[PDB]
């Protein structure tokens, strides 16, 4: 994502291809937010 | 930076070159040749009328 | 980490010091792990 910026849609773009773009909040969410799913079972599962 | 080494040797080496080519090519100073060449050569022809 | 960049690892610039990157999301981040692991606490404290 700090490589790229949007601008409107991907239609009128002519020669677009489909591929996904790494957003880097992500791995510093799902290491942690997770991680507070573990937590969640710490008290509902038993 | 990750390639410095590289880079300064390859600096130091085109700059030896330099000092080669220079005295290689007879007319690479052909620009500063000529310019005293029809400066004398004027004047030679100046003193040659009288 | 938004002011500089980054390019392979630490062993090949002739010249490098040792200092500390300050990642601006962490402590908004970790402030609020604070507060999660308060609600955790709270969520086990029964
Ligand atoms: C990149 O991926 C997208 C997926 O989001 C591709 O979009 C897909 O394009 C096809 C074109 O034939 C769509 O099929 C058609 O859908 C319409 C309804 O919108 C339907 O009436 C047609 O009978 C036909 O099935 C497909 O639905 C669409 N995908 C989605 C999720 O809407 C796109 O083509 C890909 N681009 C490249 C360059 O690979
Ligand atoms: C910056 O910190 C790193 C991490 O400790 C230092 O790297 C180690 O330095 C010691 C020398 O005291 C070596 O014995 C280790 O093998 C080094 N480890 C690695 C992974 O390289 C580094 O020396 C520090 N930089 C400076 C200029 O002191
Ligand atoms: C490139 O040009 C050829 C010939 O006109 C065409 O077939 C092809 O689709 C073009 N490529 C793209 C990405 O439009
Ligand atoms: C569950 O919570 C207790 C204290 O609230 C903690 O000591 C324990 O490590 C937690 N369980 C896990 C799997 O982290």
């Given amino acids: ?46 | 930076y990750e390639n410095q080494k590289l880079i300064a040797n390859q600096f130091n080496s085109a700059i030896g070159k330099i000092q080669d080519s220079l005295s290689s090519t007879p007319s690479a100073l052909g620009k500063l040749q000529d310019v005293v060449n029809h400066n004398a050569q004027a004047l030679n022809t100046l003193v040659k009328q009288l």
Same sequence: chains 1, 3.
């Fill in chain 1, 1 to 46: 994502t700090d490589n790229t910026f949007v601008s409107g849609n991907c239609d009128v773009v002519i020669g677009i291809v489909n591929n996904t773009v790494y957003d880097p909040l992500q791995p510093e969410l799902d290491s942690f937010k997770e991680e507070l799913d573990k937590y969640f079972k710490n008290h509902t599962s038993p």
